[PDB]
Structure 1
Amino acid sequence: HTLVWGVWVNGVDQGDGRNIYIRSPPNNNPVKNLTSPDMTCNVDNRVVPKSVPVNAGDTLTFEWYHNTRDDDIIASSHHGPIAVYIAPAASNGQGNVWVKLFEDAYNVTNSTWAVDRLITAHGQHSVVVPHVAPGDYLFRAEIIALHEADSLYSQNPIRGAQFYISCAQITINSSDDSTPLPAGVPFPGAYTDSTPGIQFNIYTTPATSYVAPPPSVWSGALGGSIAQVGDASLE
């Protein structure tokens, strides 16, 4: 159970974005139905009034929280991966348009899932803005909590993988468009019951065996990290 408070750009807080530049749902409940339109941008997908200006090569940091800013972020039980996708805003998230910019599942060295490190990072994880065409974009941050993913929602609707999905409206201003955006996957649609990483038992299968759901990260992506970039408490 977690939500996005807002974003930072190059280490500078852009301010509370909830229902402003984040298409925020009314609460922190998970999405579980893989075929629902809720998979796109969660349960209240609509245009919100602001879009955060960035340039290619900037660091864009999502900041998550549980109940209040910079709290326990997400329950520690919710071990799982984190991805970020991008699509042009014109799509409204419909069609084959989502391109993966970031994937982090399990860190063998550190013996931690992406979620574990997200908590340690005070909810902060980042991508570097790619050299796509200037214009308006949706950045879809997705946490998959796997604590009940031994079952499939489609089979048992009281269990299943949980998806915490947040779409940020981002305007890319300066960019030479040297890596124009390739084709995307659909949400809903990309994840099905057979997809690797959707059904998995984190308790009896080694985390080292986990494979996150495709698609693979676009070769045009400039990477990213799960790490605190800014101290919210200093505001």
Structure 2
Amino acid sequence: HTRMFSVWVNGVDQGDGQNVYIRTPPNTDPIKDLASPALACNVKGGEPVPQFVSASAGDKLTFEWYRVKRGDDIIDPSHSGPITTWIAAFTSPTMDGTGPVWSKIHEEGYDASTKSWAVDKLIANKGMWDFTLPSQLKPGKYMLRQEIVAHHESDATFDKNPKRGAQFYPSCVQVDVKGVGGDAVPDQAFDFNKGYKYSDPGIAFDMYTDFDSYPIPGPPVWDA
């Protein structure tokens, strides 16, 4: 359980953008059903909020996460797993992120040199999570997903046992990109509902074992 408080652009807090430029869900509840339409942008994913975060191709974006109160434990430390970041064109305001529209622009999972997960890193850095807007990205409005997966119950799956299974905590943010940018258009055209499966060994994952590495779900990060 956790969700996003606000977004920063090159070290600059844009200010609490919950229901302003973040499609904030009612609560910190997870997604578990792979079939669910909220897998993409969570349970108010399809409801537009009015403001966009104003950034540029190449800007360094920091998403701030919190559990109950801004600047608390961010997420129960049992919730160990990766942290992926995606991008899809803002096709129109009532898009809910479903369909074959997404491209992977960032990830972390399990670094075995340090035996630390992405979630370990996020707690340590106070719920701040950095990534970059590809330099060659084309101008105009996108949607930036970013999703924590907690694997403390992935030692079974939602379809076989529903009291457990992977837990998704996606947050979708509206972005208007300025500046010169480039030609590059995200064209990996990924679909959470089609593309995340219960047979995926990075979704049915026994984190309670002698394991050396973690297969991050979805495609590679996208080039240009």
User: TM tier, shorter chain?
Assistant: over 0.9
Q: Of 108, 112, 117, which aligns to 1:113?
A: 117
* Number of the residue aligned with 1:27: 27
Aligned-partner residue type, residue 150 of structure 2: A
- Is structure 2 residue 207 aligned with structure 1 residue 202? yes
CA apart distance, 1:95: 2.0
Pairing of 1:140-155 with structure 2 (within 5 A): 140-155=145-160
CA apart distance, 1:77: 0.2
Q: CA RMSD in A?
A: 1.2
* Number of the residue aligned with 1:157: 162
Contact persistence 2:3–2:169 (CA under 8 A): yes
* TM-score normalised over the length of structure 1: 0.90
* Number of the residue aligned with 1:41: 41
Q: Of 181, 184, 187, which aligns to 1:179?
A: 184
Contact persistence 1:196–1:214 (CA under 8 A): no
> 5+ unaligned residues in a row in structure 1: which ranges?
221-235
CA distance in 2, matches of 1:25, 1:193: 24
CA apart distance, 1:75: 0.4
CA distance in 1, matches of 2:39, 2:218: 15
CA distance in 2, matches of 1:96, 1:135: 19
Aligned-partner residue type, residue 55 of structure 2: V
* Number of the residue aligned with 2:74: 73
Contact persistence 1:9–1:59 (CA under 8 A): yes
* Number of the residue aligned with 1:232: none
Aligned-partner residue type, residue 31 of structure 2: V
* Number of the residue aligned with 1:124: 128
> Identity of aligned pairs, percent?
47
CA distance in 2, matches of 1:119, 1:27: 19
CA distance in 2, matches of 1:188, 1:61: 27
CA apart distance, 1:110: 1.8
Higher deviation after alignment, 126-135 or 77-86: 126-135
* TM-score normalised over the length of structure 2: 0.94
CA distance in 2, matches of 1:118, 1:175: 31
* Number of the residue aligned with 1:169: 174
SS of residue in 2 equivalent to 1:40: helix
CA apart distance, 1:40: 1.1
* Number of the residue aligned with 1:84: 85
CA distance in 2, matches of 1:115, 1:5: 16
Contact persistence 1:133–1:181 (CA under 8 A): no
* Number of the residue aligned with 1:101: 105
CA distance in 1, matches of 2:31, 2:25: 11
Aligned-partner residue type, residue 16 of structure 1: D
SS of residue in 2 equivalent to 1:42: helix
CA distance in 2, matches of 1:3, 1:176: 30
SS of residue in 2 equivalent to 1:85: strand
CA distance in 2, matches of 1:114, 1:183: 23
CA apart distance, 1:22: 0.3
SS of residue in 1 equivalent to 2:197: coil
> 5+ unaligned residues in a row in structure 2: which ranges?
none
SS of residue in 2 equivalent to 1:104: coil
CA distance in 1, matches of 2:153, 2:25: 22
SS of residue in 2 equivalent to 1:115: helix
Aligned-partner residue type, residue 65 of structure 2: W
